Coordinates of C-alpha atoms and ligand atoms in Angstrom, one line a residue:
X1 CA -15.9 27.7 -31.8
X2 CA -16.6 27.0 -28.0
X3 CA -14.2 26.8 -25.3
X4 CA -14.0 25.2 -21.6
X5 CA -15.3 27.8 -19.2
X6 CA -13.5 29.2 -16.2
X7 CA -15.2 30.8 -13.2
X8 CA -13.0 34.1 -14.1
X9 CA -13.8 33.6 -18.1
X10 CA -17.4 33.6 -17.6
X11 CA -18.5 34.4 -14.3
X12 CA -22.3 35.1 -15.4
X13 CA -22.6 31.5 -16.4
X14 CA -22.1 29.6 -13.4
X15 CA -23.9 28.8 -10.0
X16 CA -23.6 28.0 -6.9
X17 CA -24.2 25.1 -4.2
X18 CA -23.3 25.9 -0.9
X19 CA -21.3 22.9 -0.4
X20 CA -17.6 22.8 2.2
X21 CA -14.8 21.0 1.3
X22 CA -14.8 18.9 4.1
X23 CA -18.4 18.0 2.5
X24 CA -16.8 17.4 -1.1
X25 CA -13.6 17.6 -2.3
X26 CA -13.6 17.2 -6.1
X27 CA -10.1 15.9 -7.0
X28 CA -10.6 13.0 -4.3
X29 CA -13.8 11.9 -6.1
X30 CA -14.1 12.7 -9.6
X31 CA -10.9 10.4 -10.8
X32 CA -10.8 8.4 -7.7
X33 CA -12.4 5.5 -9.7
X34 CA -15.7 6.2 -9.5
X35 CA -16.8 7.6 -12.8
X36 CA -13.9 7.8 -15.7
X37 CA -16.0 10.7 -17.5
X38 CA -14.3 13.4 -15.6
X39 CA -10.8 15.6 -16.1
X40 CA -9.8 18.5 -15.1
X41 CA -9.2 20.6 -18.2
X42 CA -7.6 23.5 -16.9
X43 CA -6.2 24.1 -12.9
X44 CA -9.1 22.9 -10.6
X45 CA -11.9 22.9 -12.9
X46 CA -13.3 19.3 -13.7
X47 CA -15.1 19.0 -17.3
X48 CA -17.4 15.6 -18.0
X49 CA -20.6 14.5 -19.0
X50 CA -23.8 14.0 -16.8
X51 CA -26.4 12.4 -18.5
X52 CA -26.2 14.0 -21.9
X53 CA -25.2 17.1 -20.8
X54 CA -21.4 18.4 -20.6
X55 CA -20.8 20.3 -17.4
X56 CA -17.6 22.1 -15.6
X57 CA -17.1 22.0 -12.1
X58 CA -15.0 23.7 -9.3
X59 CA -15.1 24.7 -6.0
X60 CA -13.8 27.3 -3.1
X61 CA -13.6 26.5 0.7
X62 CA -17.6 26.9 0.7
X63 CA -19.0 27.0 -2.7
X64 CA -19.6 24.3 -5.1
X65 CA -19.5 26.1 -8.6
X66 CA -21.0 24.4 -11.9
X67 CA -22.2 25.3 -15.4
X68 CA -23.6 23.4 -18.5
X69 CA -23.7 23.3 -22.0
X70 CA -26.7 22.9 -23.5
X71 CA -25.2 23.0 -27.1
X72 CA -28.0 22.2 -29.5
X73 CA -27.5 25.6 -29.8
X74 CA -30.1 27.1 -27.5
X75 CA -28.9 30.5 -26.0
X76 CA -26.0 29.8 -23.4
X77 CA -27.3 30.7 -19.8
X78 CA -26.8 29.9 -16.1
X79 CA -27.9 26.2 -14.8
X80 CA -31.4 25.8 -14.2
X81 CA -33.1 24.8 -10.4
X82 CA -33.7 21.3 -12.0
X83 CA -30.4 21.1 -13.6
X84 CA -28.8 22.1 -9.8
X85 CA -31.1 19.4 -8.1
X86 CA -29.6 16.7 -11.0
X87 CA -26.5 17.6 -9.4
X88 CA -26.9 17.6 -5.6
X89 CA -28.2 14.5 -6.1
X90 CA -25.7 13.1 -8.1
X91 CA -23.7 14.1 -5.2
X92 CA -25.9 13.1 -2.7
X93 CA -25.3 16.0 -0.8
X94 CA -28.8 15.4 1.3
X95 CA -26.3 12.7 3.2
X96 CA -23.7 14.2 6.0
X97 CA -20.3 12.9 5.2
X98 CA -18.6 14.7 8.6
X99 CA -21.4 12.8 10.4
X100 CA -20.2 9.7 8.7
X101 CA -16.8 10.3 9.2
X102 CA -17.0 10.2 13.2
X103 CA -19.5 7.1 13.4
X104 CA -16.4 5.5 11.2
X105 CA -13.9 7.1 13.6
X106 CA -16.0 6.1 16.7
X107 CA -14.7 2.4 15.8
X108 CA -11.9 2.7 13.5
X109 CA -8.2 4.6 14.8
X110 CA -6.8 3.9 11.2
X111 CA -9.4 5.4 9.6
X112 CA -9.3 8.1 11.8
X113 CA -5.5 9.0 10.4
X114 CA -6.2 8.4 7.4
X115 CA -9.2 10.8 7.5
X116 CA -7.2 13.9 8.7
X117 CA -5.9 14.1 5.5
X118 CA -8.3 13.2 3.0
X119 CA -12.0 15.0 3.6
X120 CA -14.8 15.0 1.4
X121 CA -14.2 11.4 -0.4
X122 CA -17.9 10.7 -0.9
X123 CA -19.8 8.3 -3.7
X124 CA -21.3 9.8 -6.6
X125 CA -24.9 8.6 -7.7
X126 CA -23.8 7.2 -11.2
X127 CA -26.4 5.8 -13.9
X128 CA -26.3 2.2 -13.6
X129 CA -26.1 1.5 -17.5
X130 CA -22.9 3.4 -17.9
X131 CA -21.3 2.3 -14.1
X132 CA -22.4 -1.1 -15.4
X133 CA -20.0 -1.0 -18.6
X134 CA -17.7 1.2 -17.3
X135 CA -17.0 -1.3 -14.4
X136 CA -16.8 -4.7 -16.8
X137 CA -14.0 -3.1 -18.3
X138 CA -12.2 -2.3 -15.2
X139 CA -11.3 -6.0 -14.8
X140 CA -7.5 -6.3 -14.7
X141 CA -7.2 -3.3 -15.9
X142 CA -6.5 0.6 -14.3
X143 CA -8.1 4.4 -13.8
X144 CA -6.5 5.6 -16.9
X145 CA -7.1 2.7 -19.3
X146 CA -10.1 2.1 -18.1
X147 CA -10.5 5.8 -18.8
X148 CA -9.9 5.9 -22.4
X149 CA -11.7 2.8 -23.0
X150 CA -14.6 4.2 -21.7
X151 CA -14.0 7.7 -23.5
X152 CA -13.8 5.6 -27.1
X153 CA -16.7 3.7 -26.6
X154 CA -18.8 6.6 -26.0
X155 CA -17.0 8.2 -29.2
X156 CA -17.9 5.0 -31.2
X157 CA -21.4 3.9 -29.8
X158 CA -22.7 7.3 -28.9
X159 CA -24.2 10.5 -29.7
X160 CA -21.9 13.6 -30.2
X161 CA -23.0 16.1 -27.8
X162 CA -20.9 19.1 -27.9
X163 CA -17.0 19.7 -28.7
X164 CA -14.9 22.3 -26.5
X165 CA -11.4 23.3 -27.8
X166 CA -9.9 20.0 -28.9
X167 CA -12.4 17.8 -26.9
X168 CA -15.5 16.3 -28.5
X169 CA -18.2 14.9 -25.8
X170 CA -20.7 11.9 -26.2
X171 CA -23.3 10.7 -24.3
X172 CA -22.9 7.1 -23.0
X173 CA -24.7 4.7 -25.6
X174 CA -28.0 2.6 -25.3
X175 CA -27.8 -0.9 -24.7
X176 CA -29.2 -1.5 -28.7
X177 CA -26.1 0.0 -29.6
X178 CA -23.6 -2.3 -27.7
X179 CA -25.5 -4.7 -28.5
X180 CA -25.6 -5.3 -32.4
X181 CA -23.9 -8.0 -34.7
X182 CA -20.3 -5.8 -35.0
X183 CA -19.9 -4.4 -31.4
X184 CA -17.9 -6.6 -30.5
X185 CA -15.4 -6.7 -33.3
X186 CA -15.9 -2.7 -33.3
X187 CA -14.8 -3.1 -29.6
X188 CA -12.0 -4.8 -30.2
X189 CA -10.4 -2.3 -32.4
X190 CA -11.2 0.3 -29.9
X191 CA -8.6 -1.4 -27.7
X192 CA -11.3 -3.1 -25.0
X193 CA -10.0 -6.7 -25.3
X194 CA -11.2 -9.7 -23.9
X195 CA -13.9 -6.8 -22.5
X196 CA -15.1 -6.5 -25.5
X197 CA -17.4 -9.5 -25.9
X198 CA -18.7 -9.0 -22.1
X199 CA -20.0 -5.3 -23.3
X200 CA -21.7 -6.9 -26.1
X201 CA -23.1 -9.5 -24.5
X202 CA -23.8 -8.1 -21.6
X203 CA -26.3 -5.4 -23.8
X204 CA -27.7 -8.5 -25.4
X205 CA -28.9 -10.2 -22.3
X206 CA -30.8 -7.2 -20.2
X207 CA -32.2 -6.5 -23.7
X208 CA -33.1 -10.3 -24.6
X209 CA -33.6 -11.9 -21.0
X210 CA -34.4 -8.7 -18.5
X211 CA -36.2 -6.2 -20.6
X212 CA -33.6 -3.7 -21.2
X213 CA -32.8 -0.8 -18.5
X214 CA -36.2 -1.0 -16.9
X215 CA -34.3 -3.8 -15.2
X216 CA -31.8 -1.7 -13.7
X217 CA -34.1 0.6 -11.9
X218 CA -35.7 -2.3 -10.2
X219 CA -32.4 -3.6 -8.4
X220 CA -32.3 -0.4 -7.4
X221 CA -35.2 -0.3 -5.3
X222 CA -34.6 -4.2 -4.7
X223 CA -32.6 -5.2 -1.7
X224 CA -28.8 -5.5 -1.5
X225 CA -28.7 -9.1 -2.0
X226 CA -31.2 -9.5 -4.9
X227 CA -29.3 -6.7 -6.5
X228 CA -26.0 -8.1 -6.4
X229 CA -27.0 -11.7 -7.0
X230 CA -28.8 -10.7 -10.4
X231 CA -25.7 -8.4 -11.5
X232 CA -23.6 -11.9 -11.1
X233 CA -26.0 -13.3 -13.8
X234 CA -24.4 -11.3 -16.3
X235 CA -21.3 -11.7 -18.5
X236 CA -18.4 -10.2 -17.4
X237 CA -19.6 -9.2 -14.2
X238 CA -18.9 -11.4 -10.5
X239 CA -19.3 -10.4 -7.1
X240 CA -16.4 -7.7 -7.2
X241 CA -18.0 -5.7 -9.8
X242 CA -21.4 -6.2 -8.8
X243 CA -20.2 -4.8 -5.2
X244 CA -19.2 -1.7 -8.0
X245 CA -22.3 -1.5 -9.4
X246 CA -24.7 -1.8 -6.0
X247 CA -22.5 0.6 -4.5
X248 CA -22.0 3.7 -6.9
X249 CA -24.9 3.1 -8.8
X250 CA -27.9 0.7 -7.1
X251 CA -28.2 2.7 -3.4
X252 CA -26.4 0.2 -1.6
X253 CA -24.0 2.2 0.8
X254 CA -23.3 -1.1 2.5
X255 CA -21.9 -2.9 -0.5
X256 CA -17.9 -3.7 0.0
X257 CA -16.1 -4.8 -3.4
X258 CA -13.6 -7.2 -2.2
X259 CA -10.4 -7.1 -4.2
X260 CA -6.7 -7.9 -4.3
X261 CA -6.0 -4.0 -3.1
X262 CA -8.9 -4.4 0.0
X263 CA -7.4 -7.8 0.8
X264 CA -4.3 -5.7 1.0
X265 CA -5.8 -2.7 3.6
X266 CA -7.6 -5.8 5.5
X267 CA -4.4 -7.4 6.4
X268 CA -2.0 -4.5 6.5
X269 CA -4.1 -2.2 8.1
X270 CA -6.6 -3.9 10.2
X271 CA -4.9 -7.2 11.0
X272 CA -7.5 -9.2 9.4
X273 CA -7.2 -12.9 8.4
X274 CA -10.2 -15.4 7.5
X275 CA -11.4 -16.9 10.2
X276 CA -14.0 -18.8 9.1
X277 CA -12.5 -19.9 6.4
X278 CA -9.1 -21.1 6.5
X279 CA -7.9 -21.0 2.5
X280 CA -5.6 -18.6 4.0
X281 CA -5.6 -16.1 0.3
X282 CA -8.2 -14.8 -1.6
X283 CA -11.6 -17.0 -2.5
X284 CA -14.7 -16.7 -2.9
X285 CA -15.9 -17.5 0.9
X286 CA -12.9 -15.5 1.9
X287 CA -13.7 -12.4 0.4
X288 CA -17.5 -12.3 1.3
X289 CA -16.2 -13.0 4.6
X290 CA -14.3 -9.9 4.5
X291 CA -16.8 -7.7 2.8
X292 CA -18.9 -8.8 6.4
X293 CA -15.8 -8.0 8.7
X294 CA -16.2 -4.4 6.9
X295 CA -20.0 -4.1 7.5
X296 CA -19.8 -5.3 11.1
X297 CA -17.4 -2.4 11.8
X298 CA -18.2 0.6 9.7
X299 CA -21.9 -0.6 9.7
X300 CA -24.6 0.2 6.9
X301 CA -22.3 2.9 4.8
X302 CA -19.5 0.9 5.0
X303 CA -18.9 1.3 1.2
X304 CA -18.2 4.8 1.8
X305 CA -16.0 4.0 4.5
X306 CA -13.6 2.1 2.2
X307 CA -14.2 4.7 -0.6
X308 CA -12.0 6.6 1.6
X309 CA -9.1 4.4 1.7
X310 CA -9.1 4.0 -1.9
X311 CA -8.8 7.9 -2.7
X312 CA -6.2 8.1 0.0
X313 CA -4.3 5.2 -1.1
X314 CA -4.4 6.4 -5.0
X315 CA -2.1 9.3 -3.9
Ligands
LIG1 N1 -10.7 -1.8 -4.3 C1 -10.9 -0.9 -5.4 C2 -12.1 -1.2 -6.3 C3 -12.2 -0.1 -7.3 C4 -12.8 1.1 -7.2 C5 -13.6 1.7 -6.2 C6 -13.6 3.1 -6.0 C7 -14.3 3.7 -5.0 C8 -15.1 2.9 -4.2 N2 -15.1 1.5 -4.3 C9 -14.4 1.0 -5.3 N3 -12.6 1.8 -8.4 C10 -11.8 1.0 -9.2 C11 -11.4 1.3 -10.5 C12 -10.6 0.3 -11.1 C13 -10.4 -0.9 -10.5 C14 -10.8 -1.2 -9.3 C15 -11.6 -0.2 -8.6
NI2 NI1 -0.7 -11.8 9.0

């Protein structure tokens, strides 16, 4: 039956959010790394799931466009006010990103190139369950992998929400889920690896030792460093994917994930060698050294700041 909408196809079944590109720009930030739910089914319209819904998304110079699909086959109609607000804030479109952008440049004449170019990078406000998973499979590992481990998992673990020409949609699963006596095997034939017995036990323990997802609402409202400190707990997951986490998913703009590729920018691009330390490669003292070298300059969004680099570097 149903088909991927286009603003042309169906034009009485989308709305609008006044949103500029230099605001948002949807193909630096929907497969820039942040969430691996997203493609772009057809030419500049971006399909995924948000919280058991499917949606398509695309844009003009001044417009953000957006419709769902419901699919337990109520009537289809036009996103509600309460569907729209799910997605401004998803967006967190409250937040200036050009006023960002010149408190970065204020500081920062690299980022101030780099910035001509590539507008509207901003962070996505991701559920922490999924950015939690998705991210302990991102070890060692890259967007489009990454991607279709993610996309099989859901398939696998849970429910089927809708299917649009060939493509069949699932919400992300429940901790329970990931967590029972043959996820892990099961995981293991979906490809995930050595990832595969972090997911399960990873499920296990918020379930068994933090009292499932509850838990992951309080670091959000807890501070930076009790958030990130509790994610290192867990199996799978150290300071470079906890930095994922607080940032895309916890309300920590400040938090800097310190790999390989920022050790990379750091020295290329800024200059920057430890100091304080002197193991003169990455460590661990080392790189939460240089996740402070980045929150001394950019200040307290300076995980947005970097976010930048990243989209700009992936082209
Ligand atoms: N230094 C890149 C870290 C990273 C990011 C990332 C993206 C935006 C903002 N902050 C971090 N997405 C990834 C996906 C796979 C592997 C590593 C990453
Ligand atoms: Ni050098």
């Amino acid at each position: 039956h149903m088909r991927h909408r286009t603003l042309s196809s169906s034009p009485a079944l989308w709305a609008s959010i006044p949103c500029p590109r230099s605001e948002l720009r949807l193909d630096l930030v929907l497969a820039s790394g942040q969430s691996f739910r997203w493609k772009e089914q057809s030419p500049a319209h971006w399909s995924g799931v948000l919280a058991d819904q499917v949606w398509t998304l695309t844009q003009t110079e001044d417009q953000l466009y957006c419709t769902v699909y419901r699919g337990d086959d109520s009537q289809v109609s036009r996103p509600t006010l309460e569907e729209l607000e799910t997605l401004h804030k998803y967006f967190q479109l409250d937040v200036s990103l050009a006023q960002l952008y010149s408190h970065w440049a204020s500081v920062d004449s690299h980022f101030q190139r780099v910035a001509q170019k590539f507008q509207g990078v901003r962070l996505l406000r991701q559920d922490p369950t999924e950015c939690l998973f998705s991210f302990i499979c991102s070890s060692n590992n890259n967007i489009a992998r990454i991607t279709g481990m993610v996309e099989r998992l859901c398939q696998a673990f849970g429910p089927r929400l809708i299917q649009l020409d060939d493509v069949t949609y699932h919400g992300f699963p429940n901790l329970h889920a990931l967590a029972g006596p043959e996820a892990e095997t099961h995981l293991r034939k979906l490809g995930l690896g050595y990832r595969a017995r972090y997911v399960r036990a990873s499920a296990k323990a918020i379930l068994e030792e933090q009292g499932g997802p509850a838990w992951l609402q309080q670091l959000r409202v807890a501070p930076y460093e009790e958030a990130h400190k509790a994610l290192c707990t867990l199996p799978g997951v150290g300071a470079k994917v906890a930095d994922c986490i607080c940032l895309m998913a916890l309300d920590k703009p400040q938090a800097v994930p310190v790999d390989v590729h920022v050790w990379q920018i750091a020295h290329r691009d800024y200059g920057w060698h430890p100091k304080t330390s002197q193991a003169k490669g990455p460590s661990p003292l080392a790189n939460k050294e240089l996740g402070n070298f980045f929150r001394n300059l950019w200040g307290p969004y300076a995980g947005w700041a970097q976010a930048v680099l990243f989209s700009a570097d992936l082209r």
